[PDB]
């Protein structure tokens, strides 16, 4: 996270760390949506241009952590993964369209004060909240500039108009993504950086006070560049794929 701040303890109880098994290396953010399903970005698992094709064997997730350094005894958990599911129409070649992946935990995790699932956006929350000018929140342990934090970092960022997202890049953007971040003339900064990929973009509903995950940190041109915006997988638009996978398996 760039230009964020330290999270309060338990501020993001749905946070998940995606590690490569060996050498043990922090790869990405992720999010807990139930006692055994974790949401992340497909490109955290499959990106050929970096010779990246992980399987369930290669990875672990750590849940409930707060300080990347400190080992939080009796607070943090570790889970191997049973299977991973990349969206079939994931398009890594052209534009990272449908940058979304599900990971099933080998054994379910126990909820606690520090481990709690986020909501998937329903149709009503999606229509009221996912609008330009409304701010969401991004969290992760990625780089602080384009420099690794101890404690989870958090930043709030507004959603940007779709025409403005399109004109910021040559990439062919789709309705399965949205972009967020401040504009150069709004005098505030902030963005997700590498390491933060696959982490959640959440918004708190004023209707019922729950937090919903509207986005997955997907791509951007560097980090926190003027006139550039973070791009986020549009979680609600891929909810039926999420639901078809979870019911199936």
């Amino acid at each position: 996270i760039v230009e964020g701040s330290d999270a309060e303890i338990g501020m993001s109880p749905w946070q998940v760390m995606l590690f490569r098994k060996s050498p043990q290396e922090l790869l990405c953010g992720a999010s807990l949506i139930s006692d055994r399903w974790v949401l992340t970005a497909a490109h955290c698992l499959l990106y050929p241009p970096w010779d990246k094709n992980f399987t369930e064997n290669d990875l672990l997730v750590r849940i409930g952590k707060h300080s990347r350094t400190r080992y939080e005894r009796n607070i943090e958990k570790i889970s191997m993964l049973e299977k991973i599911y990349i969206h079939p129409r994931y398009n890594w070649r052209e534009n990272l369209d449908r940058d979304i992946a599900l990971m099933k935990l080998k054994k379910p995790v126990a909820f606690s004060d520090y481990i709690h699932p986020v909501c998937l956006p329903d149709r009503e929350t999606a229509a009221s909240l996912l609008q330009a000018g409304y701010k969401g929140r991004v969290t992760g342990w990625g780089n602080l500039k384009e420099g690794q934090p101890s404690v989870l970092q958090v930043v709030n960022l507004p959603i940007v108009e779709r025409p403005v997202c399109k004109d910021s890049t040559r990439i062919r953007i789709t309705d399965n993504m949205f972009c967020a971040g401040y504009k150069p003339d709004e005098g505030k900064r902030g963005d997700a950086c590498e390491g933060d990929s696959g982490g959640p973009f959440v918004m708190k509903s004023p209707f019922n006070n729950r937090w919903y995950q509207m986005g997955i940190v997907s791509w951007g041109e560097g980090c926190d560049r003027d006139g550039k915006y973070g791009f986020y997988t549009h979680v609600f638009r891929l909810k039926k794929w999420i639901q078809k996978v979870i019911d199936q398996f």
């Binding site: 309060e8 949506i33 699932p117 909501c119 000018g133 918004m203 937090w211 919903y212």
Partner: peptide, 30 residues
């Protein structure tokens, strides 16, 4: 049916340090 409600904040009627900035963007942001 318990998603989105944080043990250490919503469940304790405690507000985190920056969530108000989000609520206010619903007023000012459009």
């Amino acid at each position: 049916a318990d998603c989105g409600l944080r043990p250490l904040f919503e469940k304790k009627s405690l507000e985190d340090k920056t969530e108000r900035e989000l609520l206010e963007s619903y007023i000012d942001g459009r």
